[PDB]
Structure 1
Amino acid sequence: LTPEQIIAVDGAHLWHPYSSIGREAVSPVVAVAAHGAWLTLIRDGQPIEVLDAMSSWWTAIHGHGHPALDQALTTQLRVMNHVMFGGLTHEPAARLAKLLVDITPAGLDTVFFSDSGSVSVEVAAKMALQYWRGRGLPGKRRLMTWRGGYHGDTFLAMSICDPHGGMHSLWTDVLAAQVFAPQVPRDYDPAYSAAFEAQLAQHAGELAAVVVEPVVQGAGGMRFHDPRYLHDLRDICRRYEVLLIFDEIATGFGRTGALFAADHAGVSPDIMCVGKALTGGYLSLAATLCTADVAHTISAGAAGALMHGPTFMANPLACAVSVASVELLLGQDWRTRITELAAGLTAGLDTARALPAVTDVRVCGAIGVIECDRPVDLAVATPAALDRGVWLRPFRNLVYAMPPYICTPAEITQITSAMVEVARLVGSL
Structure 2
Amino acid sequence: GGLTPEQIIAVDGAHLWHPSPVVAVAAHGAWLTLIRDGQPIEVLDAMSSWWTAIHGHGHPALDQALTTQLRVMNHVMFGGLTHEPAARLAKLLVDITPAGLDTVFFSDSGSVSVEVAAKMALQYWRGRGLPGKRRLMTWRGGYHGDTFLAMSICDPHGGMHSLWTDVLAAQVFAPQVPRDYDPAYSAAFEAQLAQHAGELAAVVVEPVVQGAGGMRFHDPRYLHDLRDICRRYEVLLIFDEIATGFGRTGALFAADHAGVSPDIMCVGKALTGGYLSLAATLCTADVAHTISAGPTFMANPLACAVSVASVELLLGQDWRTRITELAAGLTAGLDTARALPAVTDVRVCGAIGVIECDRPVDLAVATPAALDRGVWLRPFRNLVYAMPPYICTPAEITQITSAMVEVARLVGSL
* Fold shared by both chains (TM-score > 0.5): yes
- Whether contact under 8 Å (1:113, 1:285) holds in the other structure is yes
Q: Deviations over 1:47-72 (max 9, x none)?
A: 00000000000000000000000000
Q: Offset of 1:174 from its aligned partner?
A: 1.5
1:231 aligns with 2:233: no
Give 1:171 deviation, angstroms.
Answer: 1.5
Deviation at residue 310 of structure 1 after TM alignment: 0.3
CA distance in 1, matches of 2:98, 2:400: 32
Which of 22, 32, 35 is the equivalent residue of 2:25?
32
CA shift for structure 1 position 170: 2.3
Q: Give the Cα separation in 2 of the matches to 1:103 and 1:44.
A: 46
Q: Alpha-carbon deviation of 1:172?
A: 2.9
1:419 equivalent in alignment to 2:404: yes
Q: Which runs of 5+ in 2 are unaligned?
A: none
Distance between the aligned counterparts of 1:391 and 1:338, measured in 2? 21
What is the aligned length?
411
Aligned counterparts of 2:229 and 2:203: Cα–Cα separation in 1: 10
Tell me, in whole angstroms, the C-alpha distance in 2 between the residues paired with 1:51 and 1:250.
20
Distance in 2, matches of 1:139 and 1:246, equals 22
Alpha-carbon distance between aligned partners in 2 of 1:423 and 1:166, rounded to the nearest angstrom: 25
Instruction: Give the match for residue 11 of structure 1.
Output: 13
Q: Hey, what's the Cα distance between the residues in 2 that align with 1:62 and 1:277?
A: 9
Distance 2:162 2:144 in 1: 13
Residue 92 of structure 1 and its aligned partner are, at CA, apart by 0.1
1:69 to 1:175, Cα distance in 2 relative to 1, 3 A: same
* CA displacement at 1:168 relative to structure 2: 4.8
The one-character-per-residue Cα deviations of 1:148-205 (angstroms, maximum 9, x if unpaired) are 0000000000000111233555213310000000000000000000000000011000
Question: In the aligned structure 1, how far is the partner of 2:165 from the partner of 2:253?
Answer: 31
Contact preservation (8 Å) 1:148, 1:166: no
Q: Separation in 2 of the partners of 1:389 and 1:172?
A: 42
Deviations 1:386-426 (A, max 9, x none): 00000000011100000000000000000000000000011
Name the SS for the 1:279 alignment partner. Answer: coil
Question: Does the 8 Å CA contact 1:110/1:291 hold for their aligned counterparts?
Answer: yes
Offset, 1:236: 0.3
CA contact (8 A) 1:162 1:169 kept: no
1:377 aligns with 2:370: no
- Three-state SS of the structure 2 residue aligned to 1:194 is helix
Asked if 1 retains the 8 angstrom alpha-carbon contact of 2:26 and 2:32, the reply is: yes
CA shift in 2, pair 1:82/1:395, >3 Å: same
Q: Distance in 2 between matches of 1:90 and 1:315?
A: 10
- Deviations for 1:308-340, whole angstroms, at most 9, x for unmatched residues? x00000000000000000000000000000000
* Partners of 1:394 and 1:169 in 2: CA distance: 24
Change (3 A) 1:169 1:345: farther
Counterpart-to-counterpart distance in 2, 1:404 and 1:253:
12
| Aligned residues of 2:25 and 2:33 also touching (Cα < 8 A) | yes
Which segments of 5 or more consecutive residues in structure 1 lack a partner in the other structure?
A: 18-26, 300-308
CA distance in 2, matches of 1:12, 1:378: 22
Q: 1:221-258, CA deviations, whole angstroms, 9 ceiling, x for partnerless residues?
A: 00000000000000000011000000000000000000
Shift of 1:428: 1.4
Which whole-Å CA distance do the structure 1 matches of 2:78 and 2:30 have between them? 34
Identity of aligned residues (%): 100
Instruction: Give the Cα–Cα distance (whole angstroms) in 2 for the partners of residues 329 and 67 of structure 1.
Output: 14
How far 1:280 sits from its partner (Å)?
A: 0.1
Give the distance between the partners of 2:342 and 2:164, measured in 1 at CA.
Answer: 32
Deviation, 1:259, is 0.1
In structure 1, C-alpha distance between the alignment counterparts of 2:405 and 2:99, rounded to whole Å: 40
Deviates more, 1:160-169 or 1:341-350: 160-169
Q: 1: CA distance between counterparts of 2:11 and 2:413?
A: 35
Contact 1:159–1:172 (Cα < 8 Å) also in 2: no
Is the CA contact (8 Å cut-off) linking 1:284 and 1:318 kept in structure 2? yes
C-alpha deviations, 1:253-288, integer Å up to 9, x for none? 000000000000000000000000000000000000
Write the distance in 2 (CA, Å) between the matches of 1:166 and 1:396: 13
1:353, distance to aligned residue in structure 2 (A): 0.7
Task: After TM superposition, give the deviation of residue 298 of structure 1 in Å.
Answer: 1.0
